[PDB]
Amino acid sequence: ITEAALVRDILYVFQGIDNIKMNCYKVENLSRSLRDTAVRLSELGWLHNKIRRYTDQRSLDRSFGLVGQSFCAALHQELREYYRLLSVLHSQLQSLTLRRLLVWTYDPKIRLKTLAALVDHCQGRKGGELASAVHAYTKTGDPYMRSLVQHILSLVSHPVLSFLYRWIYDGELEDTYHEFFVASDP
Amino acid sequence: ITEAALVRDILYVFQGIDNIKMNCYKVENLSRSLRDTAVRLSELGWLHNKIRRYTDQRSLDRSFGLVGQSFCAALHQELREYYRLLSVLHSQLQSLTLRRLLVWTYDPKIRLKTLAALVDHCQGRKGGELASAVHAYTKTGDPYMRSLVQHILSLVSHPVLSFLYRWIYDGELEDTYHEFFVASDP
Amino acid sequence: LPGTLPLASQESAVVEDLLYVLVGVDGRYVSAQPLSRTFLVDPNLDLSIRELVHRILPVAASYSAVTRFIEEKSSFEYGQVNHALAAAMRTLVKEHLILVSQLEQLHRQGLLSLQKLWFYIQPAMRTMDILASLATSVDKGECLGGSTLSLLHDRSFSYTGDSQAQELCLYLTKAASAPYFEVLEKWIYRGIIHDPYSEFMVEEHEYWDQRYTIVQQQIPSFLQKMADKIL
Numbered sequence A, B: 001i002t003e004a005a006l007v008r009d010i011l012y013v014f015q016g017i018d019n020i021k022m023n024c025y026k027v028e029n030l031s032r033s034l035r036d037t038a039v040r041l042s043e044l045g046w047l048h049n050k051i052r053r054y055t056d057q058r059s060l061d062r063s064f065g066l067v068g069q070s071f072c073a074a075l076h077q078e079l080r081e082y083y084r085l086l087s088v089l090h091s092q093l094q095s096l097t098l099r100r101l102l103v104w105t106y107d108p109k110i111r112l113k114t115l116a117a118l119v120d121h122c123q124g125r126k127g128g129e130l131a132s133a134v135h136a137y138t139k140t141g142d143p144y145m146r147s148l149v150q151h152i153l154s155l156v157s158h159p160v161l162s163f164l165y166r167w168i169y170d171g172e173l174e175d176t177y178h179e180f181f182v183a184s185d186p
Numbered sequence C: 001l002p003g004t005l006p007l008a009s010q011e012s013a014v015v016e017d018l019l020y021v022l023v024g025v026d027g028r029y030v031s032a033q034p035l036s037r038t039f040l041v042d043p044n045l046d047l048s049i050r051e052l053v054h055r056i057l058p059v060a061a062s063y064s065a066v067t068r069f070i071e072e073k074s075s076f077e078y079g080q081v082n083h084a085l086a087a088a089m090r091t092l093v094k095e096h097l098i099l100v101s102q103l104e105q106l107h108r109q110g111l112l113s114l115q116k117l118w119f120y121i122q123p124a125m126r127t128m129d130i131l132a133s134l135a136t137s138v139d140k141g142e143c144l145g146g147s148t149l150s151l152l153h154d155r156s157f158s159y160t161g162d163s164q165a166q167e168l169c170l171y172l173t174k175a176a177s178a179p180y181f182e183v184l185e186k187w188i189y190r191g192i193i194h195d196p197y198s199e200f201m202v203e204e205h206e207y208w209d210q211r212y213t214i215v216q217q218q219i220p221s222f223l224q225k226m227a228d229k230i231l
Helices: A002-012 A033-058 A067-072 A076-089 A099-105 A109-121 A150-162 B003-013 B030-044 B043-057 B068-072 B075-091 B099-105 B110-123 B157-164 C008-024 C049-054 C090-097 C101-106 C114-120 C122-127 C131-137 C146-153 C166-173 C178-184 C225-229
Strands: none
Touching: A002 A033, A002 A076, A002 A099, A002 C049, A033 A076, A033 A099, A033 C008, A067 A150, A076 A109, A109 A150, A150 B043, B003 B030, B003 B075, B003 B099, B030 B099, B030 C008, B043 B068, B043 B075, B043 B110, B068 B157, B068 C146, B075 B110, B099 C008, B099 C090, B099 C101, C008 C049, C008 C114, C049 C114, C090 C101, C090 C122, C114 C122, C122 C166, C131 C146
């Protein structure tokens, strides 16, 4: 099995589409120096699944609220870019090798590390309780994460500040789903 | 059969002149991904033959009236322009392809769908009864059609307004064909 | 015969036929099945392609179900709102016939790999997924007149934080309500009610509490506060 063939399949495992098959992407011959580097590289694609399942399972039911949309629709602007990187990497495969990928994909091994662990800390939270559980990720100090999550908060907390600027200047709260912390009694 | 050859015959089927022959323009080899778009594009010619027949057949008999002649004439100023598009399009061929015609001829598939369905709703109507059956196409709301038919009406109301401004200020009605709603008795 | 054909090259054959599938014209390999449109690709193709092709086709099915709403809801039996909603939903399909034209030209030069396609269509996969949800929530409950304008004021409030699917549903409502608002201009500064199709909120009859009666169905649900001062 040539090294180039591995570079062909890995560029797919970065998405979910499987030599490399599907929790670690067990690869199945070739030399040990190749299988090890594939294993770690293939596993980055597995993360992309956990962040894709959430933005697909919750984009189905219509009882997730108004905040749970601006979150599920802010995990996509942070995925189109991950689809631009896969674009560039594929144009050069026609040269790059395994040891050359590690430096290329060393940074998106972190953004796909916070997002894939930001959707598990807030699983059953809907409404404002979700905008309060993506804010408990800002007390981190890491200048690369605290400047990423502090952007998703600026989108998730836009619907919350939409009721507030409505329930203050006009006093007409309207939320079929119970999100705002001001509950009315018929 | 080359793709360029299809672009040569289609430029003619847009007029009525027939690989593509004559109710659909059944084409008769080539790949399926070519026949389908040709049959889709040629359906502009079958809309061109129907409008042309009504203006021609009725431009023959001299018992269609004054309003009827205006309606037939009103269908030629909206055909010279369709004669100008065929002109510019052909020049480019001397590059354009099928995947490029669809956008070029997406709008004149609508004007050739109101006019080819405006001459069937008013078939046996002569005189003012025709100027009253091209006005029952203005209650449509579609801002592109209501601003086309409301122009043919402007070129169909001129003759009706002519008599009226004659039978009001001078009282001398004259119509060998019975069009005006004021019928005299010898 | 893509089975007896090399790997890295047959992908350039699917991306050509795949572009045709976006247009809706029957392709060579990616064909359509008789009717929610379901496609078939091929029995003998690479596993790491079909699982990627089947991710794009949900932009073809969401187009073989919007073009069928334009070529249908433009009839005269539906009113002056199911018309404008079908015209302002036709300007978009044109802007999708261009985004497939720019790709048919950029593919000639070889610069369009299948992996490159799955990135460019990302916006055209999200817009054609809104128009294929209004064209199925307008036919679920038969809406014409006002109730087909209440829906476009609630499907525009549910997206209060998306800002990429609210700038859209605010272009449809702002365009599918001019014909309704041009008779309201005639029932406010004057007394005449044209409304050829029975869709306006107020209908006349033939000692005066029975002449003009408020119709309950055809209220736009954003004039509900002033449903009385109009009449």
